[PDB]
Amino acid sequence: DMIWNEEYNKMRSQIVAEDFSALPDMSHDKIIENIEYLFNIKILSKNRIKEFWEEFCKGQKAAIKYITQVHRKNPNTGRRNWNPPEGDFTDNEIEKLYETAYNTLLSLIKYDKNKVYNILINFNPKL
């Protein structure tokens, strides 16, 4: 029973949602500017951009799901799953930068794959 529960949890881990199978707009220049700003204050990090591209290549729905998972302010703790920003910031700027990351990733969700791949090599060359 224990190995069956562990294996069955491993099964649903797989085939989640629609892998490899309602979005804001902002200019391409704006998207490079926002990802370039959040790269250097350690919010949109290289691990974040990697798992962005992994959830994007399985479809737009998985990328929306992962972005809503990271940006979700948990009502018990008040902690989003973003990497905290580096530097002197007050709380309101910290949530505004998190909302900036939200809007930037959800707006590049609408773009095509070669307009994302070419925007995340100059931050992650091992995408």
Partner 1 sequence: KVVLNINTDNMCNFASYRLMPFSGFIVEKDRIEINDKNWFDMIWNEEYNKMRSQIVLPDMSHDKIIENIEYLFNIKILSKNRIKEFWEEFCKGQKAAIKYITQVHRKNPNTGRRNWNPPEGDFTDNEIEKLYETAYNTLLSLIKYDKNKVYNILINFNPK
Partner 2 sequence: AKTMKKIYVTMKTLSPLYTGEVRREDKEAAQKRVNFPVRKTATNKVLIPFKGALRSALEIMLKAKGENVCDTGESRARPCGRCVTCSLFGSMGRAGRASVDFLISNDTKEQIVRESTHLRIERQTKSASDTFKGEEVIEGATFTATITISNPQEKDLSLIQSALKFIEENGIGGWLNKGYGRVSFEVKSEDVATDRFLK
Binding characters for partner 1, 1-40, by CB under 8 A (x = yes): ------x---x--xx---xx--------------------
The answer to whether the beta carbons of residues 52 and 120 sit under 8 Å apart is yes
- How many residues sit in the footprint of partner 1 (CB under 8 A)? 12
Asked if 114 is part of the footprint of partner 1 (rule: CB under 8 A), the reply reads yes
Q: Which helix (H) or strand (E) holds 126?
A: none
Footprint on residues 37-76 left by partner 1 (CB under 8 A):
57-58
Please give the C-alpha separations between residue 22 and each of 53, 56, 76, in angstroms, as whole numbers.
Answer: 19, 15, 28
| Residue 9 contacts which entry, partner 2, partner 1, none (Cβ below 5-8 A, type-dependent) | partner 2
The answer to whether the beta carbons of residues 89 and 97 sit under 8 Å apart is yes
Q: Which helix (H) or strand (E) holds 49?
A: helix 46-57
- Residue 10 or residue 75: which is nearer to partner 2 going by CB? 10
Asked if 10 is part of the footprint of partner 2 (rule: CB under 8 A), the reply reads yes
Q: What are the helix and strand counts (H, E) for the chain?
A: 6, 0
Residues that bind partner 1 (CB under 8 A): 7, 11, 14-15, 19-20, 57-58, 113-114, 117-118
